[PDB]
Amino acid sequence: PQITLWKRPLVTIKIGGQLKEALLDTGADDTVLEEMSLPGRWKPKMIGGIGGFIKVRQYDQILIEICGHKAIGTVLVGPTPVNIIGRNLLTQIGCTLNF
Amino acid sequence: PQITLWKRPLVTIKIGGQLKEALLDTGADDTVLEEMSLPGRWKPKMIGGIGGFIKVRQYDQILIEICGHKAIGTVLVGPTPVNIIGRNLLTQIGCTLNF
Ligand SMILES: COc1ccc(S(=O)(=O)N(CC(C)C)C[C@@H](O)[C@H](Cc2ccccc2)n2cc(COC(=O)N[C@@H]3c4ccccc4C[C@H]3O)nn2)cc1
């Protein structure tokens, strides 16, 4: 579908058998979720944004369904104040910007 | 035009008679630029992101040209590490998300 930007581009995602809401975010290279229960191993990480840096857990090859589109890829989990879908998954679901 | 997300969606902008590069960013409600010389009055402000909060200067009704599309609107200026175009201007240039 097409989505306009008069409101936040929020979508429903399924990950780890849990349902969540997340922001389609073209300015994020990576996908970052608030703390949640995930299975398997993780690598410790740091990412920066406006405001300063956060330590996150990098999870690889995780399956995620994004407004019904499956994707598999890296998901970082940590103190973000908003669930964010970044370019690493946006490309896999065929998402593009048009103006 | 259409832009895919395998790379950062960076565009050229003109603002205050200066040329800059900026990130098309669907997860930003507002437009935020690194420190720059702007004319006229500004209001003091605070915005939050991943990482913590920043104080910014809110400038209103500023003209900005975004990859050749004019827009007029609020522009926040401050310690952001990347020039960001947010939804308040993305809608004015007719930008949309498609998947
Ligand atoms: C009040 O109006 C606002 C306008 C913008 C923002 S935002 O914080 O800038 N925002 C939303 C966010 C809090 C989820 C937009 C978001 O796309 C930003 C863009 C950004 C990126 C880098 C610096 C400042 C702004 N965003 C992106 C990410 C996650 O980013 C990454 O995937 N990692 C890269 C990375 C990793 C280490 C160091 C620097 C960077 C730059 C990144 O592109 N978090 N927020 C908040 C309020």
Curated annotation (Swiss-Prot), chains A, B:
The domain of life for this entry's organism is: Viruses
The active site annotation covers 25
- Region entry Dimerization of protease, spans: 1-5, 49-55, 88-99
Task: Tell me where the signal peptide lies.
Answer: none
Residue ranges of every copy of the Peptidase A2 domain listed in the record: 20-89
Describe the protein's quaternary organization and the partners it interacts with: Homodimer, whose active site consists of two apposed aspartic acid residues.
Q: What does this protein do?
A: Aspartyl protease that mediates proteolytic cleavages of Gag and Gag-Pol polyproteins during or shortly after the release of the virion from the plasma membrane. Cleavages take place as an ordered, step-wise cascade to yield mature proteins. This process is called maturation. Displays maximal activity during the budding process just prior to particle release from the cell. Also cleaves Nef and Vif, probably concomitantly with viral structural proteins on maturation of virus particles. Hydrolyzes host EIF4GI and PABP1 in order to shut off the capped cellular mRNA translation.
- The name this protein carries in UniProt is Protease
Q: What is the protein's species of origin?
A: Human immunodeficiency virus type 1 group M subtype B (isolate BH10)
The gene that this protein is the product of is gag-pol
